[PDB]
Every structure is written in C-alpha cells, then in structure tokens.
Design a protein around this ligand. Structure first.
Ligand SMILES: O=C(NC1CCCC1)c1cn(-c2cccc(O)c2)cn1
Length: 140
C-alpha cells in the first residue's frame, strides 16, 4: 500500500571543435543519465542503453555501471531513444525516453542541457522497494 518516487537526470553537452576531425566531424558531444547529488541509481538500475543514430558504429551503446554516458564526435543532432532497465522482477521493467540530442550552430555557445525525470513506482515489491530506498528513493 505505498508509492516510492526516485529522480533521474538525463542530459547532454555539445561543443564545436576548434578543428573538425579528419572524417569532417565538427562537434564533440556527450549524453548521460545520472542521479541527483548523493543518490546512487545503480541500486535500482540494471543498465542504460543509448540507441545512437544508425550511422554510428555499434549504435546500441550499453552502460551496466556508472558513469551512464556516451562520448562521441559527429556533425548532426538526432533523436536518441534512451532505455533505463530496472533491477525489478515485475512491470515496469524499464522506462524509455526520447532524447533530443541537438548540437550548437556556428556562433552559438556550447550546449549544456539537463532534463529532470521523476519516476513514481506504485506498489513495488518489498525486494525492489529496498533497491529504490537504498538509491535515495522517497515514500509519498
Ligand atoms: O554525426 C554522425 N552522424 C549524424 C548523421 C545524422 C545524425 C547523426 C556520425 C558520426 N559517426 C562516427 C563514425 C565513426 C566514429 C565515430 O565516433 C562517429 C558516424 N555518423
């Protein structure tokens, strides 16, 4: 008879290189999933899958432990599905976000963006509830 809320932060950075790569990639970028200060999402997160554009090599990028991030070089923004899988035996087993990985046009400052996500678990099992609480989760 309980609800537990946990917080995730998804974000990215992007900057124009001083000089493009030999391939002609103009930008360095980094996407991540993290917890707020002090929290450890690794208690309830099995893994984070970042689905890169098909143009990237091995575009299914998996992080089973922190940091949950991908560092890349490229020349264009794209919509990146990001799946956060839970150490959970029942539904929901994962959440999927549609992440807008946008780059800065020439002249514009570097990108430093954050998206705060609140997950509400209705009546988690006892076992999963231990994992959510150990991560810094809160009973509503
Ligand atoms: O920016 C790239 N591709 C855009 C086209 C439409 C949105 C995404 C990109 C980067 N790469 C690459 C290749 C080789 C090593 C590497 O690190 C990156 C391939 N493609």
């Amino acid at each position: 008879q309980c609800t537990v809320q946990v917080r995730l932060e998804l974000g990215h950075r992007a900057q124009l290189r001083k000089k493009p790569t030999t391939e002609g990639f103009t930008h360095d970028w980094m996407v991540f999933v993290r917890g707020p200060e002090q929290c450890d999402i690794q208690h309830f997160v099995e893994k984070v899958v970042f689905w890169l554009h098909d143009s990237f090599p091995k575009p299914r990028r998996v992080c089973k432990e922190p940091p949950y991030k991908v560092e890349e070089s490229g020349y264009a923004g794209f919509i990146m599905p990001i799946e956060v899988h839970f150490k959970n035996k029942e539904e929901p087993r994962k959440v999927c976000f549609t992440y807008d990985l946008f780059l800065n046009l020439e002249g514009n400052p570097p990108v430093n963006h954050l998206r705060c996500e609140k997950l509400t678990f209705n009546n988690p099992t006892t076992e999963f509830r231990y994992k959510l609480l150990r991560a810094g989760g809160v009973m509503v």
